[PDB]
Amino acid sequence: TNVYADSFVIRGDEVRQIAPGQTGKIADYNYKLPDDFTGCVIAWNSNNL
């Protein structure tokens, strides 16, 4: 039907927090995903940028 592309930048240590049923400062106060989330998550380092 549609594609929602959501973009941001965070430290690598918190990358694991982006998934259904996660906990953390990012997961609770920054960006919350539904438990039944369908779709893909992509991340790559941007220290040079």
């Binding site: 259904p20 049923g21 906990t23 438990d35």
Partner: protein, 49 residues
């Protein structure tokens, strides 16, 4: 419900629900068979009357 996250509570409650509804089905089947027996007895009683 009061000790674990919703993702884990889902699995635990799933196990409990499966067990309990299985118990209900067992009970209902036993009741059906026993009711058939009672119906046979009642038909015999009516014939005797």
């Amino acid at each position: 419900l009061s000790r674990l996250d919703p993702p884990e509570a889902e699995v635990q409650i799933d196990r409990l629900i499966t067990g309990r509804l299985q118990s209900l089905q067992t009970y209902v089947t036993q009741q059906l068979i026993r009711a058939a027996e009672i119906r046979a007895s009642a038909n015999l009683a009516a014939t005797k009357m």
